[PDB]
């Protein structure tokens, strides 16, 4: 673990991350898909073979040794608030089971369900303490990473509150 587990958030591709796993913001059936989905996919095309897992888990794939956990978030345009939300809990819950299980120092985590599957809504909030919530508990640097400058200083405040 790490020797004081912190949370950081930096605004740029996840693709460019530096630390030891990266989580994908991924799409059911394995696809390329789009936003963080399609970056991950050009960066790490290999992590896409049998990929694919309902939603609400994680399936990590290896890019040589480099892990791709594959975190499935709900649609919020197919799925009530509520049903929605319990799903969303559930794949930032399995991500937390795949870092412990990989023994990595550090994770490069989006924040899952906030871009296309987010049905027009604003849930940045919602999806950061949902990662809260499951990443607590581990002992690994999470570093979460975003592309809008008010989300960056949003997330970052988030952050800064509860040290
Ligand atoms: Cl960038
Ligand atoms: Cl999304
Ligand atoms: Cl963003």
């Keep these: 673990?790490?020797?004081?587990?912190?949370?950081?958030?930096?605004?740029?591709?996840?693709?460019?991350?530096?630390?030891?796993?990266?989580?994908?913001?991924?799409?059911?059936?394995?696809?390329?898909?789009?936003?963080?989905?399609?970056?991950?996919?050009?960066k790490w095309p290999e992590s896409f073979k049998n990929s694919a897992t309902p939603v609400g888990t994680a399936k990590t794939v290896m890019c040589?040794?480099?892990?791709?956990?594959?975190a499935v978030g709900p649609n919020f345009s197919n799925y009530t608030e509520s049903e929605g939300d319990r799903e969303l809990a559930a794949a930032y819950r399995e991500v937390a089971k795949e870092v412990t299980r990989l023994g990595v120092n550090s994770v490069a985590i989006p924040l899952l369900s906030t871009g296309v599957y987010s049905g027009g809504k604003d849930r940045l909030t919602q999806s950061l303490n949902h990662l809260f919530t499951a990443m607590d508990s581990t002992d690994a640097d999470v570093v979460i990473y975003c592309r809008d400058k008010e989300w960056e200083k949003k997330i970052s405040e988030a952050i800064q509150m509860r040290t």
Excluded at 20 to 40: I, S, T
Excluded at 64 to 70: E, L, M, N, R, S
């Design 1 to 42: 673990g790490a020797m004081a587990p912190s949370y950081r958030v930096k605004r740029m591709d996840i693709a460019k991350n530096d630390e030891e796993c990266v989580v994908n913001a991924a799409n059911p059936r394995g696809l390329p898909g789009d936003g963080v989905c399609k970056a991950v996919y050009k």
């Design 64 to 70: 040589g040794t480099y892990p791709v956990i594959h």
